[PDB]
Amino acid sequence: SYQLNAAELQALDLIQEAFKGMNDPMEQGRQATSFLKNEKSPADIMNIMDVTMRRFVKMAKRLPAFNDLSQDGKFALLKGGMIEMLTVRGVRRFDSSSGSWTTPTLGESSEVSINMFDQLNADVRSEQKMRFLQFFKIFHEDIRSNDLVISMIMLIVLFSPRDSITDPEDRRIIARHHEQFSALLNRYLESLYGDDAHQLNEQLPTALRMLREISASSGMLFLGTVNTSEAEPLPREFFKVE
Amino acid sequence: NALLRYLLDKDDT
Ligand SMILES: C[C@H](CCC[C@H](C)C(=O)O)[C@H]1CC[C@H]2[C@@H]3CC=C4C=C(O)CC[C@]4(C)[C@H]3CC[C@]12C
């Protein structure tokens, strides 16, 4: 039987609990103002991603799996995985018809166009744009729009082995959860789709390679295009602006 | 990465 057992259902409930605030409203402030501007600048894009980044930190801090790590292990995982998780949120939030990202607390008139890439650093913008579109295209529409699938992919990439993590128990915990989240994702998809799920599982390593590549090559995208006085600091820890 | 560390280490309650 492909039906989920109690432990699998409970793991999914816990994941949904940890992610439950990602879609909360924004408060008035720099980030909301940036999302609401029709004419967005590169700095506005940084201000927008700040919301998602802050919320990923909070999500992780709810997970028992994350809380079994040392503080240094937790820090290394977030630093190493932030942009990868952000890119997966980007796939969930991208509308192929409109060629834009939206957010679930604002209407369709509020968006970030794919063509915002055309304003970024010419050294890297073209291939980052193409990589994002190619990554988006490998997903089936009903899978990239499934919040539980997206959340699990985020956790699979968050719980990746990182060379800087040296505590042996941290490394063990990370490896075990990488495996567990991958297996749970496949079980979930089997419970919905039966044998047809297996093709999705077979594609996961291809997806992850594309995800790691795009995220690892993102760091200079804003260089020369942003004044630090206009952009949130957290994204500036991941993207070099000066 | 001072701000990432701060956000990780803060009491969100
Ligand atoms: C997910 C986000 C839109 C919704 C944000 C909102 C606060 C929410 O999470 O609901 C979009 C807006 C800009 C996108 C990045 C632009 C360039 C990028 C450059 C790349 O090389 C990869 C992907 C990213 C990081 C994009 C990921 C998704 C972002 C953060």
Instruction: Provide the experimental method for this PDB entry.
Output: X-ray
Structure tokens at A56: 């990923």
Mutate to test the pocket of ligand 1, among A58, A89, A211 (most ligand atoms within 8 A of CB): A89
Please report the domains of chain A, with CATH numbers, ordered by start residue: 1-242 (1.10.565.10)
The residue among A66, A29, A61 whose CA lies nearest residue A48 is: A29
CA distance A219 to A9: 37
Resolution for the entry shown, Å: 1.2
- Determine the distance in angstroms separating the CA of A177 from the nearest CA of chain B, rounded to an integer: 20
Q: Are strands A112-113 and A100-101 parallel, antiparallel or unpaired?
A: antiparallel
Q: Residue A240 to residues A45, A74, A110, A141, A149: CA-CA distances in angstroms? A: 14, 23, 27, 33, 31
CA distance A225 to A232: 14
Ligand 1 centroid, distance to A49 Cα (angstroms): 6
CA distance A28 to A112: 18
- Other beta carbons less than 10 A from residue A43's beta carbon: 22
Ligand 1 neighbourhood includes A182 CB (under 6 angstroms): no
- Indicate yes or no: CB of A57 within 8 angstroms of CB of B4: yes
The residue among A240, A227, A59, A74 whose CA lies nearest residue A150 is: A59
CA distance A28 to A33: 7
Q: Select from B1, B5, B7 the Cβ nearest to the Cβ of A54.
A: B7
- Other beta carbons less than 10 A from residue A72's beta carbon: 13
State how far Cα A241 lies from the chain centre: 21
